[PDB]
Design an enzyme around this catalytic site. Sequence first.
Site, mmCIF file in Angstrom:
data_model
loop_
_atom_site.group_PDB
_atom_site.id
_atom_site.type_symbol
_atom_site.label_atom_id
_atom_site.label_comp_id
_atom_site.label_asym_id
_atom_site.label_seq_id
_atom_site.Cartn_x
_atom_site.Cartn_y
_atom_site.Cartn_z
ATOM 1 N N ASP A 194 0.831 -1.208 0.000
ATOM 2 C CA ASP A 194 0.000 0.000 0.000
ATOM 3 C C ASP A 194 0.866 1.259 0.000
ATOM 4 O OD1 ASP A 194 0.829 -0.884 2.457
ATOM 5 O OD2 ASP A 194 -0.964 -0.263 3.537
ATOM 6 N N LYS A 221 -4.810 3.245 -1.148
ATOM 7 C CA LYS A 221 -5.850 4.107 -1.686
ATOM 8 C C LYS A 221 -5.293 5.024 -2.768
ATOM 9 C CE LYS A 221 -9.925 6.562 0.043
ATOM 10 N NZ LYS A 221 -10.423 7.499 1.073
ATOM 11 N N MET A 234 -2.873 7.955 13.689
ATOM 12 C CA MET A 234 -4.034 8.374 12.899
ATOM 13 C C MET A 234 -4.915 9.328 13.696
ATOM 14 S SD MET A 234 -5.164 4.673 11.392
ATOM 15 C CE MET A 234 -5.300 3.939 13.012
HETATM 16 N N1 LIG Z 1 6.448 7.526 8.528
HETATM 17 C C1 LIG Z 1 5.534 7.934 9.379
HETATM 18 N N2 LIG Z 1 5.647 9.172 9.982
HETATM 19 C C2 LIG Z 1 4.685 9.584 10.887
HETATM 20 N N3 LIG Z 1 3.607 8.757 11.180
HETATM 21 C C3 LIG Z 1 3.509 7.547 10.578
HETATM 22 C C4 LIG Z 1 4.458 7.099 9.664
HETATM 23 N N4 LIG Z 1 4.093 5.859 9.227
HETATM 24 C C5 LIG Z 1 2.933 5.533 9.849
HETATM 25 N N5 LIG Z 1 2.574 6.572 10.680
HETATM 26 C C6 LIG Z 1 1.410 6.667 11.564
HETATM 27 O O1 LIG Z 1 0.770 5.417 11.564
HETATM 28 C C7 LIG Z 1 -0.532 5.541 11.026
HETATM 29 C C8 LIG Z 1 -0.788 4.365 10.087
HETATM 30 S S1 LIG Z 1 -1.788 3.025 10.801
HETATM 31 C C9 LIG Z 1 -0.449 2.001 11.510
HETATM 32 C C10 LIG Z 1 0.894 2.066 10.794
HETATM 33 C C11 LIG Z 1 1.845 0.872 10.982
HETATM 34 N N6 LIG Z 1 1.108 -0.357 11.276
HETATM 35 C C12 LIG Z 1 2.875 1.162 12.078
HETATM 36 O O2 LIG Z 1 3.246 0.262 12.843
HETATM 37 O O3 LIG Z 1 3.351 2.299 12.219
HETATM 38 C C13 LIG Z 1 -0.604 6.904 10.356
HETATM 39 O O4 LIG Z 1 -1.829 7.537 10.605
HETATM 40 C C14 LIG Z 1 0.445 7.708 11.068
HETATM 41 O O5 LIG Z 1 -0.140 8.287 12.206
#
Ligand SMILES: Nc1ncnc2c1ncn2[C@@H]1O[C@H](CSCC[C@H](N)C(=O)O)[C@@H](O)[C@H]1O
EC number: 2.1.1.107
Lengths: 447, 451
Positions: A248, A270, A374
């Site tokens: 994604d 998306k 998020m």
């Molecule tokens: N590179 C990044 N910088 C800042 N926030 C990030 C990010 N990558 C993911 N996120 C955060 O993670 C959310 C995705 S849902 C969960 C992401 C993933 N499973 C993890 O472990 O991080 C986004 O809304 C954002 O808040």
Amino acid sequence: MDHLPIFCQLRDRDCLIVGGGDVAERKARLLLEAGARLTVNALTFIPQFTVWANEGMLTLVEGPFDETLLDSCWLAIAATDDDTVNQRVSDAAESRRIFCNVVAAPKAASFIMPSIIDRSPLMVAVSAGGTSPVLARLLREKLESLLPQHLGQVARYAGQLRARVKKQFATMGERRRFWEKFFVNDRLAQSLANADEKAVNATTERLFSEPLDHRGEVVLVGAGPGDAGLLTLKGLQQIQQADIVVYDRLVSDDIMNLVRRDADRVFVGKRAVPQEEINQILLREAQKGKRVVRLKGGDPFIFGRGGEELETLCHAGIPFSVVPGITAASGCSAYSGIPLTHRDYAQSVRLVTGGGELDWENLAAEKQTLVFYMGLNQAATIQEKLIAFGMQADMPVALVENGTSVKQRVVHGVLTQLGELAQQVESPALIIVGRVVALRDKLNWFS
Amino acid sequence: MDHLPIFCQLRDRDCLIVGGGDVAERKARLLLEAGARLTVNALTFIPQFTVWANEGMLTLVEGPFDETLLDSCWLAIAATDDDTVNQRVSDAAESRRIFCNVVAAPKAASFIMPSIIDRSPLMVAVSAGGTSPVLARLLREKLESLLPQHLGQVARYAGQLRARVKKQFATMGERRRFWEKFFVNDRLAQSLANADEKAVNATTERLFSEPLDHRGEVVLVGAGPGDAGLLTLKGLQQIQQADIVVYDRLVSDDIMNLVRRDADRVFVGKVPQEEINQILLREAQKGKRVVRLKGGDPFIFGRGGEELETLCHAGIPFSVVPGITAASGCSAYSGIPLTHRDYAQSVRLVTGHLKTGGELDWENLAAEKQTLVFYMGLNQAATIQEKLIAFGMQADMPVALVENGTSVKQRVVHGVLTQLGELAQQVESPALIIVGRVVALRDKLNWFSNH
Ligand SMILES: Nc1ncnc2c1ncn2[C@@H]1O[C@H](CSCC[C@H](N)C(=O)O)[C@@H](O)[C@H]1O
Ligand SMILES: Nc1ncnc2c1ncn2[C@@H]1O[C@H](CSCC[C@H](N)C(=O)O)[C@@H](O)[C@H]1O
Ligand SMILES: [Cl-]
């Protein structure tokens, strides 16, 4: 080729090291790993040598260099700081025809010690003859990335299995196809590393039963938060061996540029696609006997719906495994110099999402580090509620966007400014709340 | 390791091959390219030996095996179709302490011949030692694609420049920074392959002219929870280039085998905190590359802040590579996802014992819809059971202890909250305590092992 590489069997063979300092200790460890019957001649020894000598693991001879210690030897090493001594040792071994190395000096030695990648019985050795030892270090780094630690285990198992590879495979061409899905079936590899000698059989006969073109498994892999360096070794190995990669937006292009070029890719995030279609795509492309890799931002089991994707596959009897990753909290904390814990600032870190409702008084309690995933949208009402439920209005706050990436933005300040600061960023971003955010002014090493 | 690879210099050293067929020819070609003074001793010879001897490249001895022919040799290859003859050869090489190879008997004799990838003077050698020849060729061919053609020219030019680099740069540190820049210069590679000398010189002169960073550095590397495959790429680059590695109890032996063999390793397990600070600070004073290697992630209960706090003021450059925290590692390898739908809306990472005083806010920890993860809480299991029940948490809430998560010694015991106390007795440090309904997902998502 002016050096001929040979792989020596040193177990129970007399080998001599002259010198008793740090460099000798690194060559002694090397020769001890390979089972040399080792003697060490030196005018004095660093303690590590007196330890090895007490565990009965080698022999020490204190004094000047005695060329009779070479009388029954197979390899010699000069590893002293004195070129006169090294030259004497080098000359005592050439008249005896003992292969000899001078650590100080590739030239004037009958053998050079290369960089090694050990996966015994599988071994890889890299040298360029003394011209470019750094370039060999670089080659060794890359090769260590690429070879699974437990490849030697499966190397060995292939040994007494060549029996059966003929009474169930006639042509040498199919014989190699089997061999090729063998060495990449990590479910067999983990089964052998973990001595589970029934997971080993269930997968040995699944390898002889299932059609030769079928290798159907699913691997959930964490991409990490964005920096391609933050992938795992096993993660990288897995996306080198993938028939399909289902990925994604939250996976960075740096990570996608690591995926094998002759591999199918399904973009599933998306554009401007509910969970169950992703489940069916994975199920679908796995039943066709293809080795599937589901690549997900960060860590699969932290707000990634990783659980949902794997209970679709546990129905249909599809093997799977999970390679975890760096979640956004860890990355963003590290690449902004805001440690999630520090001293007694915080007894707990809370990773929270932004039906049901969030418990507000809990989030305001002191001695915490709140990390909102998020949450940029709900950011307005979050500052209201924390103030309304008694959190000190001078509580530092920080928003980290595109954490660990070459476009990372950090915005910090105070809880009273929380709503103003959330406009200044975009998804993907992290809201971090607590007293540790004040540490960035001493720990931020990125920007 | 089962073999020690070495790279022999064969120029003007005698070697014996015994046997004279298609196999003997292949090995003889290898020894001739390496500049050896060769003797072949066989009963009959395929024509290729006849021509080689015509041009004065080897000595032929027609007849049965002559032991005395070993007396001058550094290597013997037995290469006949007679096992009885091959063993007599191996037995004569052994009494003379001469490394010997037997083509039909990889497990006997003294050395094995590996497959070679030539990029002279760069050489990569591959062998599975006889167990797998298929994996040898499979690895050999894959390696053939990774190493460019011009890698030989870069390496040849590197050796020519080695003298100039040793007179011009004083210390070991700045020669290292020279060579790191040199070998990742794609322009310099194309100019050598194109034999364009004016462009080689221009880039070479600019390189010798750059000021090099004399400072040391400290890098906090997260080692992950134990499986060596869970280290990050960046973290492998750091410990493969580091000068000193300061590591502790909670870094596994598999991770430590990935450190550069010619680096020194300091242990700090059982040493307090302010000492680790100074030993780091001390070893970075020599202007070396110091890696502080920490289990897990360095900002989740590893006090990585305390270490780096000294060095923002002592003018030392530093950085941190994150690692897989024990929570993320133990969840993936126990079948227990940390979040799932709305089983949990948040996950709490908690410490097991506080700064002497101060009590955990059990009211807060008892809240519903969260996964609880206790770090170093084993010795306080019984009180966590009591307090959680005291503050509302149900009784049949499932729990799991993951001892030694992600290794081959991983134990997992599970249950419900009222069994938390007795579950802790049958586990030992290092262990994690997981509490919450995601624990029930284990019997569907456990893919690692039945212990
Ligand atoms: N590179 C990044 N910088 C800042 N926030 C990030 C990010 N990558 C993911 N996120 C955060 O993670 C959310 C995705 S849902 C969960 C992401 C993933 N499973 C993890 O472990 O991080 C986004 O809304 C954002 O808040
Ligand atoms: N492999 C493992 N399995 C279970 N628990 C572990 C573990 N490794 C570390 N731990 C836990 O972590 C505690 C040390 S605190 C340091 C851990 C580090 N901050 C991290 O992110 O992982 C130990 O007491 C133990 O409870
Ligand atoms: Cl070299």
